[PDB]
Design a protein around this ligand. Structure first.
Ligand SMILES: CCCCCCCC(=O)OC[C@H](COP(=O)(O)O[C@H]1[C@H](O)[C@@H](O)[C@H](OP(=O)(O)O)[C@@H](O)[C@H]1O)OC(=O)CCCCCCC
Length: 372
């Protein structure tokens, strides 16, 4: 089966507030558990944003069918940055999910399904588990930001663990650091920095290094990828090149490996969302009547905001956070249901008759309370 999607969202209802305003105005001790106005947000939660890591999942599927899978895993690993190609996307942030808030994403068109949940509030910890017939990926991430003085260091702390269900081979990597520049003057934007690597359980390793731009060619967008197989295996060295804002190719044969999809129409007036982004908060035939009470698609503030009601959304954002606060203080902390801690910084999808997907088949959410 298949479903129809909006591939669009209403235009932004308010202009973007300044981030540096909050920084200096809120230095004192130091941010984190400091609230921000709803207008500083884009119409999706962090759970949904991280889900965009899978916009180009077909790359992983193709990887399971190529003698040199790491080159495609490397394309996928870098692909997520493309959502920041239209600078507008860097002007706002996702809504902060409530503890135990969830987000499921089933893309039958791409043959995969994903389930995610906020497993911790302080520090904030998000757990993801994506599934496809030929692969699966788990992720325990903690987004961290650090005011560097004239810019902000953005890092998703955590290892993405990819697994080929075809052969059981494993791939791991941490998403690369990004820097939000032009906090002072000029139009804000983000660009990746330094480098990161994708390591294979079979020894193969991929090294990605982003070009540098400190004061001239504006935003950095190019990058090189050096594939390095284990000297011993029949596999051999390869090289890739491209721009995380457009595409990646095998630089030896100059063949395109990955390309960006489409942004929504008139992106500058719609947070710079890609079409995939715009489809994240839509309730289609897939979700209709199948969601637990905690999915991000059911949040009132995000919904009202998406539909343009600033005041109404602001009312709701304050309400949701206040309620979580009271539950917290009463010690009636809502505990995550679909992931369990396996170690420090590591959560794992709970399997069984009480797992997410099993409960879903029979709408078994009797023990699940409304968070708002
Ligand atoms: C790489 C992936 C990108 C992900 C970007 C993530 C950016 C980020 O989490 O910061 C946002 C925060 C402010 O949140 P805010 O919306 O008011 O969320 C609420 C507050 O944290 C509030 O204190 C809390 O109540 P508490 O009192 O009960 O805890 C509520 O439960 C929360 O809902 O400000 C800061 O910590 C400063 C950092 C600024 C950086 C911005 C980047 C755009």
């Amino acid at each position: 089966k298949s479903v129809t999607r909006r591939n669009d969202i209403p235009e932004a209802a308010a202009s973007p507030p300044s981030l540096l305003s909050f920084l200096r105005k809120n230095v004192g001790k130091d941010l984190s558990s400091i609230a921000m106005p709803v207008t500083s947000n884009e119409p999706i939660s962090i759970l949904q944003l991280i889900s965009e890591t899978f916009e180009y999942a077909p790359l992983l599927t193709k990887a399971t069918q190529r003698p040199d899978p790491i080159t495609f895993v490397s394309a996928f690993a870098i692909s997520f940055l493309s959502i920041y190609r239209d600078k507008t996307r860097t002007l706002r942030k996702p809504f902060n999910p409530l503890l135990a808030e969830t987000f499921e994403l089933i893309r039958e068109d791409m043959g995969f399904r994903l389930i995610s949940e906020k497993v911790s509030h302080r520090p904030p910890v998000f757990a993801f588990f994506a599934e496809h017939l030929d692969w699966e990926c788990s992720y325990t991430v903690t987004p961290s930001q650090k005011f560097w003085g004239k810019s902000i260091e953005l890092n998703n702390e955590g290892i993405l663990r990819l697994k080929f269900k075809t052969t059981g081979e494993l791939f791991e990597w941490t998403q690369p650091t990004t820097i939000l520049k032009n906090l002072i003057a000029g139009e804000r934007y983000m660009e990746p920095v330094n480098e990161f690597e994708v390591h294979s359980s079979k020894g193969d390793k991929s090294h990605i290094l982003f070009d540098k731009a400190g004061m001239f060619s504006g935003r950095s967008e190019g990058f090189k990828v050096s594939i390095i197989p284990p000297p011993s295996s029949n596999r051999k060295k390869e090289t890739l090149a491209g721009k995380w804002t457009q595409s990646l190719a095998n630089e030896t044969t100059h063949e395109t490996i990955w390309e960006v999809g489409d942004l929504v129409s008139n992106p500058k007036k719609k947070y710079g969302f890609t079409k995939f982004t715009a489809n994240l908060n839509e309730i289609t035939e897939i979700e209709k009547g199948n969601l637990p009470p905690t999915d991000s698609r059911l949040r009132p503030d995000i919904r009202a905001y998406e539909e343009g009601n600033v005041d109404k959304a602001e009312e709701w954002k304050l309400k949701l956070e206040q309620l979580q606060r009271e539950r917290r203080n009463k010690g009636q902390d809502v505990e995550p249901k679909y992931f369990e801690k396996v170690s420090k910084n590591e959560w794992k999808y709970i399997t069984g008759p009480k797992s997410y997907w099993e409960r879903r088949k029979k709408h078994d959410w009797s023990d699940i309370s409304q968070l708002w």
